[PDB]
């Protein structure tokens, strides 16, 4: 049997703010696994590093082949595991991913096969976050006008995407992001702008291009209902994060009043996190992030449990190539996949250059990696220039 | 990629009615996988053979590595899969187990490792169904008197077992098995015999040997409650199948009125079958049979879902060596294992000689197989003399 | 008292109707049918009927209640339920009612509580495969073809049709798209365009049932149902599978069309959660799949408390048709009878002794003792048969 | 108006693993506030440091008087706040407390007056975690025998304590802590030891000393019920953390089956975390830790909301003197207080020397600090030798 000998927690140096963090798990047989901690944006990345560092201390000396036992150890033997949480879970996730990488390298087998094989040959993708533009030379667009939203959609369509996602509310008319109060009942003008932008897209792309309406949970229950009712007639594919998950009854209230399938999951963690949303019937599409919401071991369980309640799965992807890789593996294997999320930045050099292999979509579709393990690793150059903590 | 080229459905010849049925899936690469259809007792083994035969027709030519996709095809593309059922499920299960056998043989790895590794080093066992005796020369005991029940428990203890299970109700005083009407409110004498037998066991073995009370769903709600209340004081480990699963509210009513943890699951199939019992909180211990209740792919998902509602798992085992092997692998990998079921016949030559390898418990503990795949196969001699349908 | 002496389990000479023939020492034989003639599982139904027959040899066939309870309670696997298990149970059960009627010289409907109606209204079922003669093969693709097939059925006197307009793609492939989850508009727009073409052709006074075969899931069932609401849909059949009854309730909550299901829902126990959750308006048990005469009568009775009406699911041979007609004659809560095209045609009807055909969209019930239907001697001669004694 | 100018995140050096972490918030007016991040034990203190660091970045420049607006910013403008979590919450908490310390210093008023004044003159205390002994020279103990547990209780009573808490289950007979599997149905001997130790205590102290049974969530639903039913007759004051909070229905199941009032809260965070336990009626006593479960702003709100459902409050305290101080203030102001938690280590030199002031219980009772703010600060000497990150 192999033994974990050290773990590196890598604060990935990049040219893009943006803080991808990688877990590299090392064995006495010289097989190393790579995982990603999914807190690259928002406020928390330093906490993910210290969390990954703290959890690493407790797995040194263990057999990395025992992912189920290691997952449950991190849940049950850490004290704070049993109260749950996003920082806790994201660090767990990176470690878990790295254990599956090792597992696949040990056997010479790509992740998807270890998750039950090839349930589909190609992965349908959508162009994500169109409020920030699409196409080359759109690298920091802050779109304000309906016509600009329509044009970004059309550019994505011309690139072979038959689905887009967009938050049309959170940018004000002056290009300020998320600086208005969108909680409670809102004056018509605040949401009419969002409506006109969305209706411009639909008018431009026609009925056979799917549109996902993303709210980022910047709205609350009331404003999420008010906006969702407005966009109902636009044929919305699903309605993402209308409200935060802290009281699951609020999501149910949105679902009761808005006739569009709801999606959430990037901020819902583990099977326990999803449970109340499966039981209350509020979600149609679930969006766990493999790098945030529990790792490969737990997200597979999530997807399997959600199938009982007829949910389909769009993995949330907002990190480095490692995050993309593991998402493609999961989406390839599961029966209840719907669509993959592609950010514009994920195609770009400062992202792709961090890692050894470059998997890119063609005509709106990905194919799964075929190398042993997750099929993705940081380059040596990135590791050399990235501040690193090493636990042994 | 490999291809399924033929499937043999094997009506296993044995010296023991008893009708073990084996599914042997063969590939163009010469790797064959073995699985078991768990209908060896009760009424329906011939139907399981014809079911396996019919399902085999739709998997010929498929890549056997895609067990997720194949499982979902058997659910969704058969018509009858989507109505569920025990015969349908048991055939699916035998095919599914054979697919994991292939997977393990392809990679050179034992099953427990592909299910997430070795979560425990030994597997605790109970001596099951003591009403039929225990010890050598007890080969068709039909025990009637409390003292006989005590003695059989004591024999089991002397062999290193620190837990037993027994149905003390279904034998009448004359040695007739399941021939009284045990439905509705019952005269005290009918259940007093059961209680007296159970109390004799507890007195004989003391407090530190566990007793499971098995009812085989021969009782209904009213009599299960009447009996469960009587035996509460005897320190019952769990109370098994007090009522059939067809209306899950009935199990809940028993749970509310009886202060012993309930167990069930050998006649409850798939994630969908467990769902109402998880949601209504009636079961403390779940008992899926891997060979009846959906195979490896599905019973792993059952066990994972059950952990959210704090259920522990005793795999139901009542078939040949193949059934025991797959149970051991599942029980080694899962976090939420409690105990393994050992029947007396499973130790005996007419059972063990059907298969190539001989895994036997020692001082009430099993260890898991280590050979590639499930680590168990029929012998060539058994396959030679066993009536076989071949699908190609 | 008579005694069962033997049972023949008959593989009637993909399409695999299976017949149970129960034989007595008094020379009365009863016929029933195991309702797995399509899908995957007919060989299992044979083995199941074989195994179940072993437990009824030597029994008085007049005791159908005790025999049904024995198959539930004394088989082990009965108490976990299931479609193969229930279908074999059904075929045996039907044969026992046949014996009972033959013994007394009375037709089944009378033994089920009499003639509650004189005629049985029928719909032309599964129009995506065409209607009329020479439409044996048909795999219809275009909206106008769907309307034409509907119009043909109307001209034969049918005032109601059923059609699945979604399961055939534009190229005539059957059930080869993924219809799970939220769907691109075009995938369902084709089904809508087909359905709206039928409505426009037949007018408001011809009923249309939308059949989904549970090929959709909750999300896509809701998306399609909402699309077709405006078309005046009679009911909306099997939008989702029955495995989690809460899913059916979710479709019912979001789609303003009465829901129907039952061909894959078995026994009083299987119907219970759908009665308690309010999801179904119309129930569709198959007498040959979902428990037999004894049990399907109880299903119909229980459903009446919850104001459900009943369309028996019929997709088998003439024996299946016969027993449906008897049940639908006696029950108070009948709505409509299902007629498939193939059921009218020689290869189906020739298997059996008597030919009950509808006229002007109406059936009448058989009047002979028992179920009033039997395999011909010639069919039994050439059909592979297991005999249990 | 004042401005936050810098924040020090202090890894408190100490002669006790044990990792107190202090947030010191510094203003343009030279008023500094002290808070504590409640993650001093278990796995995750490094995460709490990085989380406090990341959160501090967002409040530099803000008016520290606006604790409501700062709290909601940390909730709403961080992304991850809206998914919740223990590390996230604990860092928010340290910051929040330091804001109230500033507020009280600015006005010249102790915290309790700012929380609604003095609702009681003394604060009743229990001697906590008796499995580790009580008295001087016990720093030390890993108690195994019933008689030892009885003696520790007697020593506590002699010091003026009329209440104790103890986990009698998690030490085995050999003095190993939390090393047995306590999930699922359990053989009698595992719990009989715990029962005997607890009955020994009750016999020793008589009826008028309160005993709290602490379980640490090392049990699950089934074993929590098994043990609670055994100790029912011993007159247990409340039953603490019988099961983890991840599925609130599990707490409800213990409540239904065990006739002892339940307590939990050290791993339940914010109003939103308590909500389902209030709605389902499972908890009788709530135990939020001010340093983990949201800070003073949020924990006040928790106690107020809980009062509608007739819950009483025992603040969870297991950190440094700053933790104690803030707990005393909250418990003084709120109407629905029951009892205070005192660990042995909290009286000891390595703990108390970390901070400027020494508040000690007398005869089982504490009194509240009276200085401006929380009335507690690290010493200059501690701050000099403590590894410190400064954000500005
Ligand atoms: Mg999002
Ligand atoms: Mg059993
Ligand atoms: Mg149908
Ligand atoms: Mg505690």
Percentage beta strand of chain A: 5-15%
Q: Name the overall outline of chain A.
A: globular
In the sheet with the most strands of chain A, the strands line up as 5-6-7-8-9-10
Relative helix content of chain A = 25-40%
Query: What is the tally of helical segments of chain A?
Result: 13
Under CATH, the homologous superfamily of the largest domain in chain A reads Enolase-like C-terminal domain
Main interface: chain pair and counts: B-C, 43 and 43 residues
Q: Main beta sheet of chain A, described?
A: 6 strands, parallel
**What class do helices, strands and sheet pairing of chain A give?**
alpha/beta
Q: Say what oligomer this is.
A: part of a larger assembly
Task: Give the termini distance of chain A in whole angstroms.
Answer: 18 Å
Pfam family, one (chains A, B, D): MR_MLE_C
Binding site for Mg(2+) (chains A, B, D): 214, 240-241, 266
Domain Mandelate racemase/muconate lactonizing enzyme C-terminal (chains A, B, D): 146-261
Protein name (chains A, B, D): Mandelate racemase
């Amino acid at each position: 049997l192999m033994k974990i000998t050290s773990v590196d927690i890598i604060d990935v140096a990049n040219d893009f703010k943006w803080r991808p963090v990688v877990v590299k798990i090392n064995t006495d047989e010289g097989i190393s696994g790579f995982g990603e901690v999914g807190l690259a944006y928002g406020v928390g990345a330093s906490a993910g590093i210290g969390m990954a560092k703290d959890l690493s201390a407790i797995i040194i000396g263990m057999d990395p082949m025992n992912n189920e036992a290691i997952w449950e150890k991190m849940l049950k033997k850490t004290f704070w595991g049993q109260g749950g949480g996003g920082i806790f879970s994201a660090a767990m996730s990176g470690i878990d991913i790295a254990l599956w990488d090792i597992k696949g390298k040990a056997w010479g087998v790509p992740l998807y096969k270890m998750l039950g094989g090839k349930s589909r040959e190609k992965i349908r993708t959508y162009a994500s976050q169109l409020q920030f533009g699409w196409g080359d030379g759109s690298d920091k667009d802050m779109l304000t006008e309906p016509e600009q939203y329509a044009q970004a959609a059309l550019t994505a369509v011309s690139e072979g995407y038959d689905a887009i996602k967009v938050d049309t509310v959170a940018m004000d008319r002056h290009g300020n992001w998320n600086q208005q109060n969108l909680n409670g009942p809102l004056t018509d003008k605040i949401l009419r702008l969002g409506y006109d932008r969305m209706a411009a897209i639909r008018d431009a792309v026609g009925p056979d291009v799917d549109i996902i309406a993303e709210m980022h949970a910047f709205t609350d229950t009331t404003s999420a209902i008010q906006f969702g009712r407005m966009i109902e007639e636009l044929g919305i594919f699903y309605y993402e994060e209308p409200v935060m998950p802290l009281n699951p009854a609020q999501m149910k209230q949105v679902a009761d009043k808005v006739n569009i399938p709801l999606a959430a999951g990037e901020r819902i963690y583990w099977r326990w996190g999803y449970r109340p949303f499966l039981e209350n019937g509020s979600l149609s599409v679930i969006q766990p992030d493999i790098c945030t919401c529990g790792g490969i071991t737990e997200v597979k369980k999530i997807c399997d449990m959600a199938h009982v309640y007829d949910k389909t799965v769009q993995i949330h992807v907002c990190g480095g190539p490692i995050s993309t890789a593991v998402a493609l593996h999961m989406e390839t294997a599961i029966p209840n996949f719907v669509i993959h999320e592609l950010h514009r930045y994920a195609l770009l050099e400062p992202n792709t250059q961090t890692c050894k292999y470059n998997y890119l979509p063609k005509n709106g579709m990905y194919e799964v990696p075929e190398l042993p393990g997750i099929g993705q690793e940081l380059t040596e150059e990135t590791m050399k220039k990235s501040p690193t903590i090493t636990v042994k």
